[PDB]
Design a binder for this molecule. Structure first.
Ligand SMILES: [Cl-]
Lengths: 161, 156
């Protein structure tokens, strides 16, 4: 009969009518310093949103979201990515990004720009295992990744050497 | 925890992707809640409040082949007029405007007489359904304002 607080939250933060990917992309890529006015974190299966004590959960779709932040000097640990609170070391930098699965298939291969928050997000098939490689100005980092339901959505262990 | 998050947990929708939730609902063999799907979201209600779950990259189209009788339908929901041919085998083909075959599958209609397909967004094309040497066809589109229910499929 009446609009939920959850539905109203969506409407007031610019998120109504968007697909869940567009919502995640919009939030992760917002060109503001952190923290954002509301909290947002992402797991293998849910986007969690909050205006205060109260939490809304939006199911993800067919694709797993991995957000990673390459670094040169220092890093911080991360399991589920905070779209609203975390700052990576390298904002607005051009990277070359390659994701390859366990049987050699290239899933991602392109030039990507890190966001204001220093992260890059990719949308990946679920239940794969593979490798992410990142490269910047002659330097590279790589790390094993997986996209099962218990896999992390945040990868910060990418020291460029 | 919000009314919304609790609702999902309580009805065992927690940790499912939005496609799994839609599939579960549409394919159920008497859900204690209401549900309606649009081009861009799933609406859920407990009768007091309405929750909205954004869909993903694919459009959900639910359709009902028929032989003798049919009913008009805008967006697909649990309530309203149901389909006509429950738990039957069909062969479903979807071709896009440039002739690419998008789906070609044998699919079983659900207890409500519908079949659901997940399609790329912003495409136009044709849906064709076969059953016992009879066929039905209809133009379809998956734009942000297209309907998610198609009942105009007379098997002939
Ligand atoms: Cl709510």
């Amino acid at each position: 009969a009446m609009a939920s607080s959850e539905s109203a939250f969506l409407a007031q933060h610019g998120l109504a009518g968007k697909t869940v990917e567009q919502i995640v992309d919009t939030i992760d890529q917002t060109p503001q310093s952190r923290p954002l006015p509301y909290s947002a974190s992402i797991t293998s299966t849910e986007l969690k949103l909050s205006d205060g004590e109260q939490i809304y959960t939006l199911p993800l779709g067919d694709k797993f979201y991995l957000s990673f932040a390459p670094y040169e000097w220092r890093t911080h640990p991360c399991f589920n990515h905070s779209l609203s609170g975390c700052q990576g070391e390298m904002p607005n930098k051009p990277f070359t990004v390659k994701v390859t699965d366990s049987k050699g298939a290239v899933i991602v291969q392109k030039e990507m720009q890190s966001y204001r928050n220093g992260f890059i997000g990719v949308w990946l098939p679920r239940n794969m295992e593979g490798t992410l490689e990142v490269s910047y100005n002659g330097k590279t980092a790589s790390h094993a990744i997986a996209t099962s339901d218990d896999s992390q959505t945040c990868l910060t262990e990418l020291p460029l050497r």
